[PDB]
Amino acid sequence: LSLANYLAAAAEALRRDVRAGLTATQKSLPPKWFYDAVGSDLFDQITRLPEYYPTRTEAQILRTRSAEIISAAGADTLVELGSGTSEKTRMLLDAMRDAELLRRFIPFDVDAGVLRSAGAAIGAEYPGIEIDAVCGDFEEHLGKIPHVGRRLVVFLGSTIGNLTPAPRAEFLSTLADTLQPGDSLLLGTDLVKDTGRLVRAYDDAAGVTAAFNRNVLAVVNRELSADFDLDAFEHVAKWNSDEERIEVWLRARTAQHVRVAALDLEVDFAAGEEMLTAVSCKFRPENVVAELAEAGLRQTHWWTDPAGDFGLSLAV
Numbered sequence: 001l002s003l004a005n006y007l008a009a010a011a012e013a014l015r016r017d018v019r020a021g022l023t024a025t026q027k028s029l030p031p032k033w034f035y036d037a038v039g040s041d042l043f044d045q046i047t048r049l050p051e052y053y054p055t056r057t058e059a060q061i062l063r064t065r066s067a068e069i070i071s072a073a074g075a076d077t078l079v080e081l082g083s084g085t086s087e088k089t090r091m092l093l094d095a096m097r098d099a100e101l102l103r104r105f106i107p108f109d110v111d112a113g114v115l116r117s118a119g120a121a122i123g124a125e126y127p128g129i130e131i132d133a134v135c136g137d138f139e140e141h142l143g144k145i146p147h148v149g150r151r152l153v154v155f156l157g158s159t160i161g162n163l164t165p166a167p168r169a170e171f172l173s174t175l176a177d178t179l180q181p182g183d184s185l186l187l188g189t190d191l192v193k194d195t196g197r198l199v200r201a202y203d204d205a206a207g208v209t210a211a212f213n214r215n216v217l218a219v220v221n222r223e224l225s226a227d228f229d230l231d232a233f234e235h236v237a238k239w240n241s242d243e244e245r246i247e248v249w250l251r252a253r254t255a256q257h258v259r260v261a262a263l264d265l266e267v268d269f270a271a272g273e274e275m276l277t278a279v280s281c282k283f284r285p286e287n288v289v290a291e292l293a294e295a296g297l298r299q300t301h302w303w304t305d306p307a308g309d310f311g312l313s314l315a316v
């Protein structure tokens, strides 16, 4: 009966996704499922690897531009699509508080655990603001986001790059319909650059990205009673020149037979068979403008870091 419980209210979606992904001829698993407690902690670690420049690069821009962004938006409500990295969130909240504008915070995530942490953290640090955690998939459940106040919706970390172009276009269009006049969108997009720098960012020496990738198998093992042997799958990251995107795979070292008991499903991996677990699309600055335009959104500002590694867009 409680609004807070409705908003914070997945298991069905994982079942559907795992069945479809593992029974396809080209096997795949969606990257939205990487970020359980263990995966989120590993992502955290990823944000501090020397190879993985995106987080600190976008953080650098936000540290410099948050006050400008807040000034331009005039928003009183921060909506974050995909939570879990509060260092960036705090920068925008601080600026909104500085401006005497901050009334409300709405974190949005597919993982209920991540929402609780962010809600608790921001709740303790920002007195006198309304907090509504919204649990959902940003490809399906944007409607669950309350339509209140003037909302600055932020979608950082190049998470938009984890959508392929058709789903990405549908996401932007649905996002645009959810925004009301006066609302603003802040979008982070990692940029095309040296291909070796790109591959290494998803294939670090410390082996952390590999553990992060293999952890999706642990999620499925736990949630659906499967028996993936994690060490039997090799992490592989590749650049796709045609699509200008990183592609992340798990490759079976030897033939594998996997029983997914909760789905009453048995699946086979040939030796050398690869399963797609993520893409990370890299953008050209002029194209972000075009993709936003297609969705009916008008980019009003573009910022980049001092090295030009990463892009941040403000639109209405």
Ligand SMILES: Nc1ncnc2c1ncn2[C@@H]1O[C@H](CSCC[C@H](N)C(=O)O)[C@@H](O)[C@H]1O
Pocket (backbone or CB within 6 Å): 031, 032, 033, 035, 040, 043, 055, 081, 082, 083, 084, 085, 088, 108, 109, 110, 111, 114, 136, 137, 138, 139, 156, 157, 158, 159
């Ligand atoms: N399809 C989806 N719907 C809702 N949340 C998603 C999602 N796919 C990934 N996420 C969430 O988004 C986060 C991505 S990693 C952290 C992103 C953070 N905003 C940053 O910039 O660093 C995770 O918490 C993950 O659970």
Ligand SMILES: N[C@@H](Cc1c[nH]c2ccccc12)C(=O)O
Pocket (backbone or CB within 6 Å): 031, 046, 054, 157, 158, 159, 161, 162, 202, 209, 212, 213, 248, 277, 278, 279, 280
């Ligand atoms: N949004 C992040 C997510 C990510 C970082 N490292 C990964 C490794 C595998 C899959 C996804 C990721 C990115 O594409 O940069």
